[PDB]
Design a protein around this nucleic acid. Sequence first.
RNA 1: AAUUCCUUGUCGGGUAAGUUCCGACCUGCACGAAUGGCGUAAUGAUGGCCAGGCUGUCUCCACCCGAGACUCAGUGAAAUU
RNA 2: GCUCGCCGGAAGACCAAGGGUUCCUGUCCAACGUUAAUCGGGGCAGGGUGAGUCGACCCCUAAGGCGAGGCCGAAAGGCGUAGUCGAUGGGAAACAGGUUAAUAUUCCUGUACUUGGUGUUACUGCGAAGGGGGGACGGAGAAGGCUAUGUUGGCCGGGCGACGGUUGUCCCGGUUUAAGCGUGUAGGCUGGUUUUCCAGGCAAAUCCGGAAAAUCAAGGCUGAGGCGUGAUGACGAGGCACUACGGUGCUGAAGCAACAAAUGCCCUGCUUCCAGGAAAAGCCUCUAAGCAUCAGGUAACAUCAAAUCGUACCCCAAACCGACACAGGUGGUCAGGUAGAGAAUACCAAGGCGCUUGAGAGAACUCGGGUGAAGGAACUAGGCAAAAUGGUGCCGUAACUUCGGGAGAAGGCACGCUGAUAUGUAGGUGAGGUCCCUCGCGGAUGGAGCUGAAAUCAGUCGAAGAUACCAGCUGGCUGCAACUGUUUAUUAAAAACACAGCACUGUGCAAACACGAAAGUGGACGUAUACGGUGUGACGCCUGCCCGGUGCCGGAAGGUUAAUU
RNA 3: AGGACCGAACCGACUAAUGUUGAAAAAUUAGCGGAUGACUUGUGGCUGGGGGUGAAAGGCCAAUCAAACCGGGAGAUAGCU
Lengths: 271, 46
Amino acid sequence: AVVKCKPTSPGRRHVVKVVNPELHKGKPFAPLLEKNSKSGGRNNNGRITTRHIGGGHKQAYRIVDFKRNKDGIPAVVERLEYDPNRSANIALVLYKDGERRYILAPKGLKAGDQIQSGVDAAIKPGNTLPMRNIPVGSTVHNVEMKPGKGGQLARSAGTYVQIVARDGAYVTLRLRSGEMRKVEADCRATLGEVGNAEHMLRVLGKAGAARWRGVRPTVRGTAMNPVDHPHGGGEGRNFGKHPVTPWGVQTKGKKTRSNKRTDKFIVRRRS
Amino acid sequence: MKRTFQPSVLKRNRSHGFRARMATKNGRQVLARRRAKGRARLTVSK
RNA sequence: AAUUCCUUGUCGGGUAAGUUCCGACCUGCACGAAUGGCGUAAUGAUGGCCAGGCUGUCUCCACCCGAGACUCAGUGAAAUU
RNA sequence: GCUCGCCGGAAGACCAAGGGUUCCUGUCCAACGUUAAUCGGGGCAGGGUGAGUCGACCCCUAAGGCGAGGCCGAAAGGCGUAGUCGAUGGGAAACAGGUUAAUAUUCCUGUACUUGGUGUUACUGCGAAGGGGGGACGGAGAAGGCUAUGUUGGCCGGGCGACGGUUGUCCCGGUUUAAGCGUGUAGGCUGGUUUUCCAGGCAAAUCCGGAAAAUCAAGGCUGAGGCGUGAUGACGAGGCACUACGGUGCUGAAGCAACAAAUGCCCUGCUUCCAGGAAAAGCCUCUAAGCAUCAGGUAACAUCAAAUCGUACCCCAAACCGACACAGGUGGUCAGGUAGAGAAUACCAAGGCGCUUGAGAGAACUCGGGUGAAGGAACUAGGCAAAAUGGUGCCGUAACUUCGGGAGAAGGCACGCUGAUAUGUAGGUGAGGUCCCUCGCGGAUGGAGCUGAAAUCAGUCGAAGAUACCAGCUGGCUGCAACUGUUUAUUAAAAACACAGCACUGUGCAAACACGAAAGUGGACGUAUACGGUGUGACGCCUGCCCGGUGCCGGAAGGUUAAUU
RNA sequence: AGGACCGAACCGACUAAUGUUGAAAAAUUAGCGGAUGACUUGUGGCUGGGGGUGAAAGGCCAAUCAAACCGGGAGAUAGCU
């Protein structure tokens, strides 16, 4: 549910919250927790390799099962849990044999819902099957890119891909970016859409809210002096050059994809 | 006013201690230079 | 106009008197729409302006209480030349 | 030694860090001390630091470091696996009293506790580099129950007043006692017990997880404080004999109650919120390989062991960082009285200090303050500075507005003391007695005692009752930026930077991009509702025309065009 | 509930005076801002010089910053004093 905070102070006027009463109001499943230390955007050389990363709330990593290889064993959803590591919510599922796991929460999955994986699973949201058995034209998520390595596509809050065609050992998919990509017809995918669609409607409302997320402030570059940035310098606001990164790349249309290793799985890149 | 030197024995030994110097080739050259000069106190160990 | 050179533009307001300020005028030297335009409640150790209160800020300084300055004893510098 | 003054959320007390003998005693005064010096953190000499329980070491790990092989790199070397290090975190146990010129939870007295080795006895499935549990965790808020502690009364001892009064509702002092052990309370959490079964916990498992039945509701865990014991003790105001008037033997009364009450404890709790809140070991269990009249395990008793290093002293400062015995800087702990909302402020207690040149004089001028006739911003770049406002309660409060605000708008009224209502009220606290009871730290009734606002009425003193310290000037118009924030340490705090929001653009994951000759790492254990870059900068109304130039993104005929041949 | 309000500790540094061979190579005094947060602080760790870090001032990187410090090339060169 999207709720707008009342303007009791400057900083709450524009705050828009996404409150989900169904989320578990308690500690997560301890056996599936792991330490997750922050990096501040610095690599093993100690240099900042990604700017605007630092601070934020302490977070514990939840081991989410993106492979869904427990075939032939029904699982019942125990509860929906908040996951600080991702935009989507996770679901604690208990299998008939007594094993518990975390999975991405689909659109309409609730406590007590039954899910299954394998080639004989039913075509209902939350079930995972190889795309060979998935009917064409259906909506799936957590899509594997290579058989057996776990889902990598459509994992965000309200993302999903659509199976458009299946010619041979490959199936063509339309991604949220609009790209038309084909993958092997043995990669597992989960029916339905990742359910947190309202996640995009949140409004942070203040600078501190971004700092909680661990995002450090961004300095434009036109206010940086020439020694620090190509855009820096000038008496006043001049900016008389083409827009460019730090380090001197265009940033306003210049395509940067130079992989060429795949160059077959792309059909309708985008736009 | 806080001054530049804020003593700490642990930090002193870790940064300039004898074992720290021996840990790298350049540090070992520092000891060799000081030995050649005849320094009474090779490092800040004690 | 944080932009107007001519310029203290012209008119009105405020003052006994206002190159500032406020409201209009448009002849915009040389505004202008995300290097954003125009508004905007709240906020500001922010810029400008006007009032009440308040006063030694001032007309115009007077006296007083203390620390130095001055004298005695002890110690005893400096720039410069 | 007697006065005076100053600090008292410290200018007192105890530590870490850092220093390293500055500690105590004797002795000396050249130099050092901004003066003298008999004195000193100065010179010289001697003395002083006592631990199974405090800390370190040690066991365990975080960030991170190193890193056998390994991968990579002209060399040097880089990264990193297994591992091994690394506290600022987790992990066994001691308290009170006494004592030295200088140390003590370390010595002494009294009374305790912890972890191991060995031996005896009794009963026994023991076994890990493996599994599970536990350890184990956020912010804010809300009370309730407590204690530290304080006040008063009672009790005990002493006192009868340098000047009117003071045998009383008077004055002064004391009224202190731990860990441990026993009890398991206010309160918090959780349904127990038995049987059968199983794709899970890398194999196994009686353990964990899951499933299906049967039977009972009382089972368990956690838990401040209180009470009992510890304690016929210790301590204790004062006495009595030595008493070099430096102190030691002995003795030593009362040692209770009520009320108030924490920021400390119950509480790692409870409630709530989103930004969703370490790790590992010790510890408790489970079995595998193995060993089973052994070995090992559990309980009792006995005995032995618990090493080594630190321990003086300063530690908001004269001993640390600032060249100084320097208006500076420096983390943690303790937190009395009156007034007060208070850790503000004033005056005080415990305790500690008067800041290492003084003595006179009472000119100009400077510094820091007090007051001021009449005027009241005429000063000045500018109300700079100063003056002024200042508290609580009630009444009352505009334009505008994003409906929250603006607002403490503005403005007005009342504040002391005494008596009465009421020999102290409303309220809080709660004894005795009675009754009930699963007979206990219980429940109900009960109201003694204690504590105690606020208000009304009447009276009364002063020029003045929020009398001191403390403690908003207010209003009108307007530029800029939405806002809280950030910035030129050391002349600029702003209209500059950030900002939420918006838009463009890149990026399909071995992502773009970034640091790296490379390996690799960050991005991210993320996956287009994501991430990077760029510009704009809340919100409201909007964001027009131009693609010739430059850039970017596509295109295809033709022209031109490198190595090569 | 709040990058909410008033206000100590704590963190800052808007104004004035003093000081300017200072008590102090940036402080003192009286006012001033924030004071549950984009807060503050102890301990340890990481990032290294054309590099770091930077809510961006060319700020900061040991009282030194439009390229730190130390040693070396080195007696650089100096048509200038």
